[PDB]
Subunit: 101 residues, 8 copies
Amino acid sequence: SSAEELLRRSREYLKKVKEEQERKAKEFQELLKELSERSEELIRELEEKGAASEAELARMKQQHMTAYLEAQLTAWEIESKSKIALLELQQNQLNLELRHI
Amino acid sequence: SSAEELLRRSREYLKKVKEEQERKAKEFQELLKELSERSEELIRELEEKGAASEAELARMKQQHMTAYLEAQLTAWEIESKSKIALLELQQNQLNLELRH
Amino acid sequence: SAEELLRRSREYLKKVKEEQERKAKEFQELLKELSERSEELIRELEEKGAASEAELARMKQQHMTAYLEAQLTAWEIESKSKIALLELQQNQLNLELRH
Amino acid sequence: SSAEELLRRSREYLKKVKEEQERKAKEFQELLKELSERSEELIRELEEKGAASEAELARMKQQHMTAYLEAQLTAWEIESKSKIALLELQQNQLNLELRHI
Amino acid sequence: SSAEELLRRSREYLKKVKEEQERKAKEFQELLKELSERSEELIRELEEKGAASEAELARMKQQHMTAYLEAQLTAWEIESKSKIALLELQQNQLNLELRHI
Amino acid sequence: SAEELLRRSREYLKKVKEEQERKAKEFQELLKELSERSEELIRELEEKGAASEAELARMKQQHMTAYLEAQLTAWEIESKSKIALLELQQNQLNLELRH
Amino acid sequence: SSAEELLRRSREYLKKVKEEQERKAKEFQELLKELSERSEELIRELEEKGAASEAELARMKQQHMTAYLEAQLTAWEIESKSKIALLELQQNQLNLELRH
Amino acid sequence: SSAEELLRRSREYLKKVKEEQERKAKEFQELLKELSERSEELIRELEEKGAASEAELARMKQQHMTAYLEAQLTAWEIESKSKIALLELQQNQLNLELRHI
């Protein structure tokens, strides 16, 4: 009863954290999408202006793609690590309930 | 009773740790906001002066956005790790409460 | 009740594992696309003589070096992810036999 | 009795380690503040003397903020990892206290 | 009986994960070999055409070996971490087998 | 016999903890020395006008930036080291009470 | 008996893992030796030609020694981590053998 | 008896690893000492030749001290991590003996 209430509060508190992680993951993708499209807009403007040397933009383009690639890998590593860690806490939570209940 | 004291004390201390980490998270967003808002202001100044080449300001702006993104990812990594460890510590606490 | 929770626990486990396969596949598609763009940019340069022979060598090697770094990183992620869930799959299996 | 003595001693040595880390955290903040204020001083002297181009100073100023943001994150990472790790040891200490004595 | 089925299945899924990592390890070596041989090709063309100074080529050649050494260490780090981690899971699987069935 | 092993186990534990304090102190002495050398080199430059005002600013900031990085690194090491042994000290204390 | 088979099989497999890691350690020292011996040869060639400034070869030599030192530290970190993990795994194995 | 023999073999095997770590630590310090003194010999030669600009050597010197500082920190981190990990295996070894024994 009282144990059922605490385990209840712990389970629903665990879900808010899980949903809180899903929020941050989406928020990052939106941020990266905006920044990446701002960078492409900058590089595109140069190509229109022709201000940047053909080699200059090639180096600029490859840096944009490289950092974007790097940004995704980091976000992939973070969310992957978070989801897996929460899952173990989901198992501990379940282990507590069955054993007690 | 005496065990009720210690376990209640631990719960409240965990509560303080959780709040201090929420502070540091918010404080960082405020710091990153200010500094980032300065960096955008500097690049604005350079644009209006035309004190940097068109390509150079493309490089500076993209470096600015790259560092902001790196910073957000790092703070996201720290807070995500903190919240989940405390979550495990809170489970140990809960298990003890149940144990008693 | 114990079976329902554990069955529901295995389903969420399955979704997480499946999702991790989703991201790994998506990355390889992203890597190939960006990789094929990068070699296209390098293609155009050499054809136009835009970059010096020394310049294109450093550019090509930067591209291969970045591609190798990307794979090793994605390898480390997917490798660690799969093994971490693998311990959770064993934790799940241990819970089931417990009942 | 000796269990109580050994465990009370444990409680104190662990209270000292915790205070030691609060001390190190403050010292770094004072350290970063002093050095970070030299940087602004060196830079203000440049802007005053006009000894760096408008872009050089902007690159220097954003370099300073970028390094400052990294120092805070890195210090935040250490103190956070330390506080959480010590927290778990206090839990073990608390578990022994309920058991051993 | 069902324990034996669940555990034998576990044994097989874990044998598949192990073979999968031996596969990934080889693929990388083939991958590194192909790209690493392009680098030597691009560089041999430079030395032939004399399109880089004596020092530039030396800096490029030592750059190539330095990156190659990093790729091996990094791949060695991953495969080693993977093999050891899987090894422990095989031990848990072996522990269950002695117990559950 | 159990007491001898555990007493001997605590002595080796003590040596390791003491040794870790030795390295932490030694590093701060190394850092200060190298740091004081570096600021001496920078001192000589500005006095001789060897480096431009812009040059010395970047040099000074590189030195402070490297010093900060060194401290954070040594902080992370000594902090992690002490906590890791602290769990081993608790493991030792748990073994003793077990007897 | 049947348990004696499995635990003996695990001991021999652990034995193979320990040996494969000794291989990789030695193989790396051989690779680092060759490449490092090439790098020293290149800098020798440059010295005899006088194809690089005196200061430049000081920078190149010091970069060469820095990378060799970084490489050794990394391989030292990998093997030190591997040997100690297997050592823990070998202890789990031993505990099982004792358990039976 | 037979257990006393296996635990014996495990304890002495643990000591060879511990001594093996002490070897690598010393070996590194010797290597760093030699390389560091080779670098100082190079920088010293330049100052005698005066080949390097007074600012050039100042940058060169600071890089030598910085990398040396970095090298020590890495070695400090490795040996510290190794010694602590071996110690836990020393505790597990002792725990196995007393319990069996």
